């Protein structure tokens, strides 16, 4: 496969090698939240990423990713929508050529700078790839980012994008505490859709955080210098690496907070 974000790779082409594209649990949606509704019935949210242990970085041609160690409950969300256990596998962000675009999900139709991704597998499936084909298989918290201070917490992963610049190079990333890129509220609205790139699988349960984090123009000047192609190859700078929103059809999106 050969999809991409361009104008002849870009989202509006992926149905036609990923029928599911078109499917009735897509994401991201538009977050109305004159629609959404409190669920009183929703436990509460439960993160735990102490023991987290990150191990590498990787440019994969379509965003970075930051990987953990998932061998072990480890780092795991739990509560919330969920039942079970979900153990993180790897973050990554979307963001934008302009800070006016670049999230996936929206919020009343507005579009942040770039949206963070926290991907998690439900330990009762064994195994990733089996989570992947479940309904219930993935849980992924999405936390918001807008252009305004500096998250220090972020730095660290600015700071080694210069070593990944094109598609293929990874590096060393042990260390790292994805505890600094929450926000202070964990209040979330939740709703069932589907990874946001092929293979578009209707496997995940999304937590996306109200609360946006704040970022300086610096960090995000610096994730628009990396490419989506590979070393040796006309440069393609690795931005608008986003899909729009997607028809909601019979979903109800539910808020944890009054
Ligand atoms: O970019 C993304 N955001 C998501 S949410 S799913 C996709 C990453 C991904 C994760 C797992 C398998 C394939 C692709
Ligand atoms: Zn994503």
Known sequence: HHWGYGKHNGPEHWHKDFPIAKGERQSPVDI???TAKYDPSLKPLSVSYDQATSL???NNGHAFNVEFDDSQDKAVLKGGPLDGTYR????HFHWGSLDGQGS?????????AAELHLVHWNTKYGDFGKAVQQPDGLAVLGIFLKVGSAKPGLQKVVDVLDSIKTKGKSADFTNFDPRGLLPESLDYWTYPGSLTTPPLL???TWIVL?????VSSEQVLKFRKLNFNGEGEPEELMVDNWRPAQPLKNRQIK????
């Open 104 to 112: 996936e999900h929206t919020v009343d139709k507005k579009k942040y």
């Open 202 to 204: 209707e496997c995940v």
């Open 56 to 58: 590498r970085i990787l």
């Open 255 to 258: 808020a944890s907070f009054k």
């Open 88 to 91: 993180l596998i790897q973050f």
């Open 210 to 214: 109200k609360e946006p984090i704040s």
């Open 32 to 34: 109305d939240t004159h």
